[PDB]
Design an enzyme around this catalytic site. Structure first.
Site, PDB file in Angstrom:
ATOM      1  N   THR A   1       0.820  -1.218   0.000  1.00  0.00           N
ATOM      2  CA  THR A   1       0.000   0.000   0.000  1.00  0.00           C
ATOM      3  C   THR A   1       0.854   1.268   0.000  1.00  0.00           C
ATOM      4  O   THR A   1       1.684   1.445   0.864  1.00  0.00           O
ATOM      5  CB  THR A   1      -0.857  -0.078   1.281  1.00  0.00           C
ATOM      6  OG1 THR A   1      -1.607  -1.301   1.174  1.00  0.00           O
ATOM      7  CG2 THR A   1      -1.798   1.116   1.445  1.00  0.00           C
ATOM      8  N   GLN A   2       0.566   2.148  -0.932  1.00  0.00           N
ATOM      9  CA  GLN A   2       1.088   3.523  -0.933  1.00  0.00           C
ATOM     10  C   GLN A   2       0.101   4.491  -0.244  1.00  0.00           C
ATOM     11  O   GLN A   2       0.520   5.473   0.396  1.00  0.00           O
ATOM     12  CB  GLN A   2       1.383   3.957  -2.378  1.00  0.00           C
ATOM     13  CG  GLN A   2       2.354   3.040  -3.126  1.00  0.00           C
ATOM     14  CD  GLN A   2       3.715   2.887  -2.425  1.00  0.00           C
ATOM     15  OE1 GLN A   2       4.254   3.862  -1.848  1.00  0.00           O
ATOM     16  NE2 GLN A   2       4.227   1.628  -2.378  1.00  0.00           N
TER      17      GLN A   2
END
Ligand SMILES: [Cl-]
Ligand SMILES: [Cl-]
Ligand SMILES: [Cl-]
Ligand SMILES: [Cl-]
Ligand SMILES: [Cl-]
Ligand SMILES: [Cl-]
Ligand SMILES: [Cl-]
Ligand SMILES: [Cl-]
Ligand SMILES: [Cl-]
Ligand SMILES: [Cl-]
Ligand SMILES: [Cl-]
Ligand SMILES: [Cl-]
Ligand SMILES: [Cl-]
Ligand SMILES: [Cl-]
Ligand SMILES: [Cl-]
Ligand SMILES: [Cl-]
Ligand SMILES: [Cl-]
Ligand SMILES: [Cl-]
Ligand SMILES: [K+]
Ligand SMILES: [K+]
Ligand SMILES: [Mg+2]
Ligand SMILES: [Mg+2]
Ligand SMILES: [Mg+2]
Ligand SMILES: [Mg+2]
Ligand SMILES: [Mg+2]
Lengths: 234, 233, 202, 196, 204, 216, 239, 213, 201
Positions: F1-2
């Site tokens: 996840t960014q």
């Protein structure tokens, strides 16, 4: 003849001659013995010296604080497998911060060693191991084979004239669980001594000992360090 | 015809057994370990007076504290010797210490049995090395002599001969060896033995000799130093 | 976009508006955002049309093959799991907010949300898309446990109509589907068939 | 900032280069040589980014020499210039571009003297005279003014000097000495450095 | 602009049974002229030429790599390439680099090797082809070139009139572009000969 | 996840005599929107170990999938060895560090509670692989609002009974409902003892709003 | 000679290398599976080749998923390899589809893996046959058997190894469709004792496992006390 | 934009004596304006003769110490002896440099005995530059500790004072004093001071309470 | 940092300060900036400490392998080229190294400057580091090829000293080495504070 050169060739009797031949490499190795009580696992090995001026080949190897091995058969295959075992142990401590259970490590050996038995141009591992360990389930002695089979043992001997050592071990095995360490190692040595020609004896030059247990990390005893164990034998 | 990784009914790899027979085609080399250091000695086996004897190098420096004598198929020994040199320098790089004689020997011996033809890189090793090696050196365990053969088995020896007359030479080594023997006695003994087993008459150009001692680094005997030792024998 | 699905005893109701926009241009005013994934399993699509069409096509393929291999109708939960695996794995390269709903003989009518980011949760009813913001209050006040099929279709049509009035990114017609052991029944509400709530004039 | 210049007469190519290696506010070497011998009758003069310049030139040099060993005769100046260009161009859009500006000077038995200019983008132009570096901005017009195609080598060394005196007068950088070489049918000749 | 770093201009024009192609001669780097005899038009056949404007390095690379492909084609096929086929070959070459293109926009001019019908086209830097029946232009003074071509070109010109028209179109166009000029070269392609001329031109 | 999407707020834990209690509300927020109001943010890992997660709920579901399968795999062997709470915490530390080092984190902060061989275990792991053990833990706003109350009680009385730890946790959950704008008044409490892992819920705190009439 | 590679048909259309692998299975001691009203029970005649081995060494019964047991005969290293393949297939199925693998699908997938080793000179066929057993309320009891050729079928009762026929004859006497797992374990023990050749192989252990309503669909070892009573019933029935 | 690092505080110190080495650290683990825990020591036993202190980003401290632990075992297996203090230092230099382009955000100080039995301290930067030192402070309060050690152990800036060998008793008193001073002024240093003393007999441990604010 | 070296009739003088900094913090005053590559070759440290030490340690490894393989000592030219070729591959990745490789081989005294930008140049004198400009002033005014040995020591020492005075990032002690034909020797280590007392009062 036509069925004995390739590990991928089943014989008409349902056998794989290359696996059987790899097992002969272990039968011709020098004898080693493994046994256990309720608190300790012990390895004892006869070391061969090629000539009177050579040191005696190492037979017992450290794997992890809780595991060691004795070998019989091709030394280079033993090192390769010992390096694999070492790495699997390190990985387990790295990931889980706990020792790899001994039975799980033996499973990994069985899986790793089975692979080349099924692929063309590969060969079995030409080495048998006795594995001494201690974990949450107590002491263990396992045996591994070039067939990739493995065995959980009360005690075992492999190598040349090991049938003698196995007969001694069966004879006395009802005693092993309750033995103190000194008694247990003595039993190991007596069994190993059964493998020797009538003239010859156990000496500080030809005996190697490995011990692990509840209060004792895997430790190798050679040369002058085996003397305490050899005195008060017979 | 069968594969290179085929076991015989006796549990040996045919290729390794055959490589061991190739060692017997090699010229004789001798190693002796003493409390004062180790000596390595080798028969050059000159085949023509037109060949430069200095271009036969059957004893080589691995590092300042370790030498190596070889017998068998000499061209095969090059990648082994280079691997030993590179490993000692890697160890120095990483740990800022000298690598033990046992450890160098172990590193080289792990190349033995890395051959075969369906598993590995496009042009990987097709066969074992037809070489036996004597590693002689000094580390914190003191002077040490190790032997390795094409099986990848390696072992410490107080004295060892390899090559064509190694039976013979090993018998004489049993006779003369003792634990308190001086380095100078070991040097004399190994030249006496080479002299017996060599087909040619021993002289200061058709043998090589080297030592390693706690005192000093790997030293190849010069012609003049050989001449001096050869006088008594 | 506004999307919705709602569970009843024996099936599900799905609905969507029909507006696809590029910026504030309406590129399709009659979009079909309810996509069949198998005989009795649909998904409602919101977010990037390219992404949701691509993912729906891929899941349809995966679920079809699975179902032939097992020789059984697929579970609604399996369809949702397949969406979830793809939406989660590729969450950094997709803009997809999905509702999976359908019927199977093992668990009956079911609704799953797979919002952006690729979590998956079963719900009694689910809403999504840009227009869903405007109807959280309405659905929270209006929802009743035990609604019939005819009541669920009304609830969905009403909710979507309200969203469509307020959300510039939603509008057009209301597409509805009801799924049950008997099959799929699709219909469109258009024009005067769309529920009407006066502007608060004066 | 490095300076290269070449001037092609009827049967010769004259080349010069400054002898400075600079870093920040200091000259770190005052006898630096920017010329690479490719063969008996070819010089490559190379300037640009540190590392790239020597790496590129020495790669070209070794390959030109290899061609001679493989084939028993040398690449022509033109063939060498095109080989150089191909390599630089091929690297332009790669993970390893070379930021270098070059002159190639040569004499061919059958074609006579040749001078080639190449920029880091790998555009190749044959020219009667050329120059690289900020110093080219101050000297190219002097060459345009005084050159002729039949210019003798004694006169060409004067013309070269005028360019170099112009750098002493007008250029903001301290470039006090220059390497000078001439190529002809008889190979590469070292001339005296031109120094101030 | 990458396309203006070297400057330059090329154009082609159709006549009755003939075609013309022309180019400026300047090789420069931004404001600095480096040479005044830089080749931008390359033979691809006895009666088929390609002119390339744009980044000089890519002018040269595209000409060379195109020649590689064309030589192989002609050896394998045992015939001279048709103009339309050369266009397609060039389009394919440029489009291979769709995501890191060569900075060149070629023009092609020739006569069919068997029928001698006139052909002209141009391509953008990623290989989009455009065939016309009048003229094509490419370079840093495209607008100036369009203005001259639109006003002067007429159908079915003989070779002498074609020569004067393309020449006047080039000379007056490049004279309103800082980074094109330093001379103009013109090739007139006819069934039985090629006529190559350099023009008296401004050198500023 | 960014970029986290649906997220959970604080997770609390405290050791007590004979076990560990953890708590977490049942909300998945989507920015400020209280979107998914009945999700469990606690996992029973095995008989000795439980886990609670703050942060991205999809990434939690992934960890639950992976960890759940790891426990199944181990159970298949039937060999007398089980992952300890400490082992699981170690594994999780490695997993989070490894993902951090690929610049692709699992966007979670976790609390692992366990009981094995007569010892209470309580460990923290964050998305960067920062991990440690303590007698009490609180992630998110819990670090500011709950942890001071936990530590104040533990300083007066380091050994709590189960009921004392449970009451202390309820008081913290109340504070968090008053003062964390991403909290929700529906929570679970999970307890591990000798007897195993029990998850209780949905629970609510009583609240007091008398202060609403104390402005003028 | 036509029998050296699994990529060579004989002139009669046989693949002798697969038949030879089958001979390895047929040399092994016997394992049986019986499906009944409420589950599946496995039993194995586990020959003890040395009294030095621990009771429990060289298990021939495995858990391959929480709801799936596997019983094997033949070359044990090959069998363990297949148990790992089965485990991986079950695990991957759960990760991908989100529920427990149906037994029939698991059998079909592992059978295709076995089959892949019957086509090529590059690899040899597995020298094992194995049974897979499961129970769930939705699917009922299921028992499959897979051989070295990769064929997979479902069974009411099955036996593999050297006394396979003798065992099938005894299994056929049971009305297993109407019996419970608790009844059937005794019968499994009884049948292993009947087909064991006590003159030609001296010592064996009975290994027993089951999966059924009584284990809540979990594959488990039969509890020690129940195994011991089953053995006592089998021994006394041998009378 | 994800950051893979955070600062977690911690001060470390090592002192070499003639026949001892001291390695000391506070036990506070911090983040932002918060305390994670008051009982997180920054010292790790490597062998009977060698201890390492690690401060900075705790994620990297934990990973790096586990890597070192694995590498010590690998060494022992391949060479049949424990790694010396010097060899550990050399190796650590290479491990740090392997992450030259994504560094371990760790300040390391090794304290132990050399092969003659004398105290040895090695200090490192995050990419593995290192040297032997007589004493060294690292981490959060290092600029506070180091000058006093320069003055009191190095005798710097002092005239007319005898340069005596450093006794264990005086080293211990200095260690406690500089940490107490640091706990007054560095917000990150506090809770407790853990001290490891390495001598021929083994490693012993003392702990001293520090302010908890 | 300030380092310098120069060739002269009697070999190569190599000198350095001993300060390391982290921002404005003085991290050490006892850095060994003259790196003993082998008994006939020295390197120097400026720019990044780890970067110089690591790559020169790799250089040392390779030179020893060379000597074993070829049975002769590597030239200063070839050693400096190995180092240049190693670092070239990493240009643009932020290595910081400025070193002088100093020896005496078949071409006599040898001195090359090598850096992480890709430069590799032979020369008579060099100075590298933040204080190099200050060392150059003093070294340049005193330097000759025909300096007597003690005059060369004094010049090197004074040039580093003066750099330490003006350059905030240079200080500690001045360490001086002399490469002779039969190897290098360590000539002196003088604390700057003690040099201050000497060069004034
Ligand atoms: Cl053996
Ligand atoms: Cl062997
Ligand atoms: Cl076996
Ligand atoms: Cl045996
Ligand atoms: Cl021999
Ligand atoms: Cl759409
Ligand atoms: Cl969403
Ligand atoms: Cl959504
Ligand atoms: Cl939307
Ligand atoms: Cl619309
Ligand atoms: Cl091409
Ligand atoms: Cl929810
Ligand atoms: Cl759970
Ligand atoms: Cl069978
Ligand atoms: Cl110093
Ligand atoms: Cl080399
Ligand atoms: Cl140079
Ligand atoms: Cl610097
Ligand atoms: K709308
Ligand atoms: K403080
Ligand atoms: Mg996209
Ligand atoms: Mg570059
Ligand atoms: Mg113009
Ligand atoms: Mg002009
Ligand atoms: Mg405070």
């Amino acid at each position: 003849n036509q069925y004995d050169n390739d590990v991928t060739v089943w014989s008409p009797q349902g056998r794989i001659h290359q696996i059987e031949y790899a097992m002969e490499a272990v039968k011709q190795g020098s004898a080693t013995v493994g046994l256990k009580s309720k608190t300790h696992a012990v390895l004892v090995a006869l070391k061969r010296a090629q000539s009177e001026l050579a040191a005696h080949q190492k037979k017992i190897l450290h794997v992890d604080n809780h595991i060691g091995i004795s070998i019989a058969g091709l030394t280079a295959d033993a090192r390769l497998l010992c390096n694999f075992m070492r790495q699997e142990c390190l990985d387990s401590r790295f990931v889980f911060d706990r020792p790899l259970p001994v039975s799980r490590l033996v499973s990994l050996i069985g899986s790793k060693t089975q692979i080349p038995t099924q692929r063309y141009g590969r060969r079995p591992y030409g080495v048998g191991l006795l594995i001494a360990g201690y974990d949450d389930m107590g002491p263990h002695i396992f045996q591994t084979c070039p067939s990739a089979n493995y065995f959980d043992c009360r005690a075992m001997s492999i190598g040349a004239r090991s049938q003698s050592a196995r007969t001694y071990l069966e004879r006395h095995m009802s005693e092993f669980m309750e033995c103190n360490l000194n008694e247990l190692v003595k039993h190991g040595l007596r069994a190993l001594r059964e493998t020797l020609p009538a003239e010859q004896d156990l000496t500080t030059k030809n005996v190697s000992i490995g011990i692990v247990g509840k209060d004792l990390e895997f430790t190798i005893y050679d040369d002058d360090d085996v003397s305490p164990f050899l005195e008060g034998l017979e | 015809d069968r594969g290179v990784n085929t076991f015989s009914p006796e549990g040996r790899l045919f290729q390794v057994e055959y490589a061991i027979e190739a060692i017997k085609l090699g010229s004789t080399a001798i190693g002796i370990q003493t409390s004062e250091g180790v000596c390595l000695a080798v028969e050059k086996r000159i085949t023509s007076p037109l060949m430069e004897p200095s271009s036969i190098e059957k004893i080589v420096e691995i590092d300042a504290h370790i030498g190596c004598a070889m017998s068998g198929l000499i061209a095969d020994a090059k990648t082994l010797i280079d691997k030993a040199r590179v490993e000692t320098q890697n160890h120095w790089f990483t740990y800022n210490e000298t690598m033990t004689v046992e450890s160098v020997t172990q590193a080289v011996s792990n190349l033995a049995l890395q051959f075969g033809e369906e598993d590995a890189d496009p042009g990987a090793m097709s066969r074992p090395f037809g070489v036996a090696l004597l590693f002689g050196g000094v580390d914190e365990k003191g002077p040490q002599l190790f032997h390795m053969d094409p099986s990848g088995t390696f072992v410490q020896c107080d004295a060892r001969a390899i090559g064509s007359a190694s039976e013979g030479a090993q018998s004489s080594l049993q006779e003369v060896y003792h634990k308190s023997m001086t380095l100078k006695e070991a040097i004399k003994s190994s030249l006496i033995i080479l002299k017996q087993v060599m087909e040619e008459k021993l002289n200061a150009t058709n043998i090589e000799l080297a030592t390693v001692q706690p005192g000093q680094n790997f030293h190849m005997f010069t012609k003049e130093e050989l001449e001096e030792v050869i006088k008594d024998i | 976009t506004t999307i919705m699905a709602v569970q009843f005893d024996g099936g599900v109701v799905l609905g969507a508006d029909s507006r696809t926009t590029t910026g504030s241009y309406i590129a399709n005013r009659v979009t079909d955002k309810l996509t069949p994934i198998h005989d009795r399993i649909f998904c409602c699509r919101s977010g990037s049309a390219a992404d949701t069409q691509a993912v729906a096509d891929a899941v349809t393929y995966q679920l079809g093959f699975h179902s032939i291999e097992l020789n059984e109708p697929p579970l609604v939960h399996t369809a949702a799991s397949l969406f979830k695996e793809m939406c989660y794995r590729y969450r950094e390269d997709l803009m997809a907010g999905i509702i999976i709903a359908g019927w199977d003989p093992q668990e009956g009518g079911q609704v799953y949300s797979v919002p952006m980011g690729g979590m998956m949760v079963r719900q009694s009813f689910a809403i999504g898309g840009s227009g869903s913001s405007y109807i959280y209050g309405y659905v929270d006040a209006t929802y009743r446990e035990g609604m019939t099929k005819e009541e669920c279709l009304q609830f969905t049509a009403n909710a979507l109509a309200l969203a469509m009035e307020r959300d510039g990114s939603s509008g057009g017609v209301i597409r509805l589907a009801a799924i049950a052991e008997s099959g799929v029944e699709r219909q469109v509400l258009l024009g005067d068939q769309i529920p009407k709530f006066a502007v608060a004039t004066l | 900032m490095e300076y290269l210049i070449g001037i092609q007469g009827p049967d010769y190519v004259l080349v010069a280069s400054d002898r400075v290696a600079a870093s920040n506010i200091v000259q770190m070497k005052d006898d630096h040589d920017k010329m690479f011998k490719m063969s008996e009758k070819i010089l490559l003069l190379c300037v640009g980014e540190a590392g790239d310049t020597v790496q590129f030139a020495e790669y070209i040099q070794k390959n030109v020499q290899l061609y001679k060993m493989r084939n028993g005769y040398e690449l022509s100046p033109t063939a060498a210039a095109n080989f150089t260009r191909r390599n630089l161009a091929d690297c332009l859009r790669s993970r390893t571009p070379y930021h270098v500006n070059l002159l190639l000077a040569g004499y061919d038995e059958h074609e006579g003297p040749a001078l080639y200019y190449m920029d880091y983008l790998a555009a190749l132009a044959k020219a009667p005279f050329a120059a690289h570096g900020y110093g080219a901005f101050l000297t190219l017009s002097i060459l345009d003014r005084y050159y002729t195609p039949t210019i003798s080598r004694e006169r060409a060394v004067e013309l070269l000097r005028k360019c170099l005196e112009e750098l002493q007068k007008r250029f903001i950088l301290n470039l006090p000495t220059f390497s000078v070489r001439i190529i002809d049918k008889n190979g590469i000749h070292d001339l005296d450095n031109i120094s101030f | 602009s990458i396309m203006s770093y070297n400057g330059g201009a090329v154009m082609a024009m159709k006549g009755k049974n003939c075609v013309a192609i022309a180019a400026d001669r300047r090789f420069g780097i931004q404001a600095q002229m480096v040479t005044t005899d830089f080749q931008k038009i390359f033979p691809m056949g006895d009666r088929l030429y390609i002119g390339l404007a744009g980044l000089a390095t890519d002018v040269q690379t595209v000409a060379q790599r195109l020649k590689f492909r064309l030589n192989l084609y002609e050896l394998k096929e045992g015939r001279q390439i048709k103009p339309y086929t050369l266009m397609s070959m060039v389009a394919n070459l440029l489009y291979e680099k769709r995501f890191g293109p060569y900075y060149t926009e070629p023009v092609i001019a020739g006569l069919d090797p068997k029928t001698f019908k006139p052909f002209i086209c141009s391509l953008d830097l990623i290989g989009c082809p455009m065939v016309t029946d009048d003229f094509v232009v490419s370079g840093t003074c495209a607008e100036q070139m369009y203005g001259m071509c639109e006003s002067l070109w007429e159908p079915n010109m003989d070779p002498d009139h074609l020569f004067e028209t393309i020449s006047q179109a080039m000379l007056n166009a490049v004279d309103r572009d800082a980074v094109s000029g330093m001379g103009v070269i013109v090739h007139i392609i006819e069934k039985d000969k090629i006529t190559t001329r350099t023009l008296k031109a401004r050198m500023d | 996840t960014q970029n986290p999407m649906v997220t959970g707020t604080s997770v609390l834990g405290v050791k007590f005599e004979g076990g560990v209690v953890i708590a977490a509300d049942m909300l998945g927020s989507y920015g400020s929107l209280a979107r998914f109001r009945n999700i469990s943010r606690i996992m029973r890992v095995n008989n000795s170990t439980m886990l609670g997660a703050s942060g991205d709920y999809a990434d939690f579901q992934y960890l639950k999938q992976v960890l759940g399968q790891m426990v199944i795999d181990e159970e298949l062997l039937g060999d007398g060895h089980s992952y300890s709470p400490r082992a699981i915490h170690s594994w999780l530390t490695r997993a989070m560090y490894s993902r951090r080092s690929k610049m692709n984190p699992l966007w979670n902060t976790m609390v692992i509670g366990g009981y094995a061989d007569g010892e209470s275990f309580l460990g923290y792991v964050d998305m960067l692989g920062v991990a440690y053990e303590a007698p009490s833990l609180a992630t998110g706003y819990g670090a500011y609002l709950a942890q001071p109350l936990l530590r104040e009680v533990l300083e007066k009385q380091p050994v709590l009974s189960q009921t004392e730890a449970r009451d202390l946790v309820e008081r913290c959950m109340r504070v968090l409902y008053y003062r964390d704008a991403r909290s929700y008044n529906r929570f679970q409490i999970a307890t591990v003892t000798e007897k195993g892992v029990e998850i209780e819920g949905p629970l609510s705190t009583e609240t007091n709003w008398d202060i609403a009439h104390m402005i003028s | 000679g036509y029998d050296l590679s699994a990529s060579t048909f004989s002139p009669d259309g046989r693949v002798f290398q697969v038949e030879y692998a089958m001979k390895a299975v047929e040399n092994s001691s016997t394992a049986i599976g019986i499906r009944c009203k409420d589950g599946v029970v496995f039993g194995v005649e586990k020959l003890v080749l040395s009294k030095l081995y621990e009771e429990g060494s060289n298990k021939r019964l495995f858990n391959v998923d929480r709801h799936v047991g596997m019983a094997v005969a033949g070359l044990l290293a090959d069998a363990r390899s297949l148990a790992d393949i089965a485990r991986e297939e079950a695990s991957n199925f759960r990760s991908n589809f989100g529920y427990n693998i149906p037994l029939k699908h698991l059998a079909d997938r592992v059978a295709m893996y076995v089959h892949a080793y019957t086509l090529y000179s590059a690899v040899r066929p597995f020298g094992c046959s194995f049974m897979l057993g499961s129970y769930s309320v939705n699917d009922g009891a299921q028992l499959y058997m897979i051989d070295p050729s990769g064929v997979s079928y479902g069974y009411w009762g099955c036996a593999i190894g050297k006394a396979r026929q003798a065992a099938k004859t005894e299994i056929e006497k049971l009305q297993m469709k109407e019996m419970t797992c608790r009844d059937i374990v005794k019968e499994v023990a009884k049948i292993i004792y009947i087909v064991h050749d006590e003159v030609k192989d001296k010592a064996f252990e009975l290994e027993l496992s089951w999966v059924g309503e009584l284990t809540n669909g979990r594959h488990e070892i039969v509890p020690k006390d129940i195994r011991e009573e089953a053995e006592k019933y089998a021994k006394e029935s041998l009378k | 934009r994800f950051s893979p690092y955070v600062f977690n505080g911690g001060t470390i110190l090592a002192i070499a004596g003639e026949d001892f080495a001291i390695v000391a650290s506070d036990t506070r683990l911090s983040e932002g304006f918060s305390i994670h825990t008051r009982d997180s020591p920054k010292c790790y036993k490597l062998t009977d003769k060698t201890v390492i202190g690690c401060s900075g980003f705790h994620g990297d401290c934990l990973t790096l110490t586990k890597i070192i632990e694995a590498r010590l075992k690998m060494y022992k297996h391949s060479n049949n002896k424990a790694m010396t203090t010097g060899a550990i230092a050399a190796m650590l230099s290479t491990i740090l440099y392997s992450r030259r382009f994504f560094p371990y955000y760790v300040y390391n100080i090794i304290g132990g005995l050399d092969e003659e039995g004398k105290g040895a301290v090695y200090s490192f930067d995050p990419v593995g530059s290192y040297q032997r030192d007589s004493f060294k402070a690292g981490g959060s309060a290092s600029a506070m500790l180091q000058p006093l050690l320069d003055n009191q152990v190095g005798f710097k800036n002092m005239q007319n004072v005898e340069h005596v060998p450093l006794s264990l008793d005086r080293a211990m008193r200095l260690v406690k004093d500089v940490f107490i001073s640091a706990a007054e002024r560095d917000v990150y240093t506090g809770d407790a001071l853990r001290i490891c003393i390495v001598t021929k007999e083994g490693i012993r441990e003392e702990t001293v309470s520090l302010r908890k604010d | 940092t300030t380092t310098l070296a120069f060739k002269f009739r009697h070999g190569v003088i190599v000198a350095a300060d001993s300060r390391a900094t982290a921002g404005a913090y003085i991290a050490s005053q006892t850095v060994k900036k003259v790196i003993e590559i082998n008994p006939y070759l020295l390197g120097t440290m400026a720019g990044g400490a780890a970067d110089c030490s690591f790559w020169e340690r790799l250089l040392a490894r390779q030179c020893r392998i060379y000597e074993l393989r070829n049975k002769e000592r590597i030239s200063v030219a070839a050693a400096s080229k190995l180092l240049a070729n190693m670092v070239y591959q990493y240009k643009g990745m932020g290595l910081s190294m400025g070193t002088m490789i100093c020896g005496w081989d078949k071409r006599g005294p040898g001195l090359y400057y090598v850096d992480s930008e890709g430069n590799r140049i032979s020369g008579a004198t060099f100075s590298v580091g933040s204080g190099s400009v200050y060392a150059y002033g003093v070294m340049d005014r005193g330097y000759s090829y025909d300096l007597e040995v003690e005059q060369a020591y004094d010049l090197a020492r004074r040039a580093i000293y003066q750099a330490t005075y003006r350059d905030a990032y240079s200080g500690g002690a001045v360490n001086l080495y002399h490469v002779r034909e039969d190897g290098w020797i360590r000539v002196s280590s003088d604390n700057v504070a003690d040099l201050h007392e000497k060069y004034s009062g």
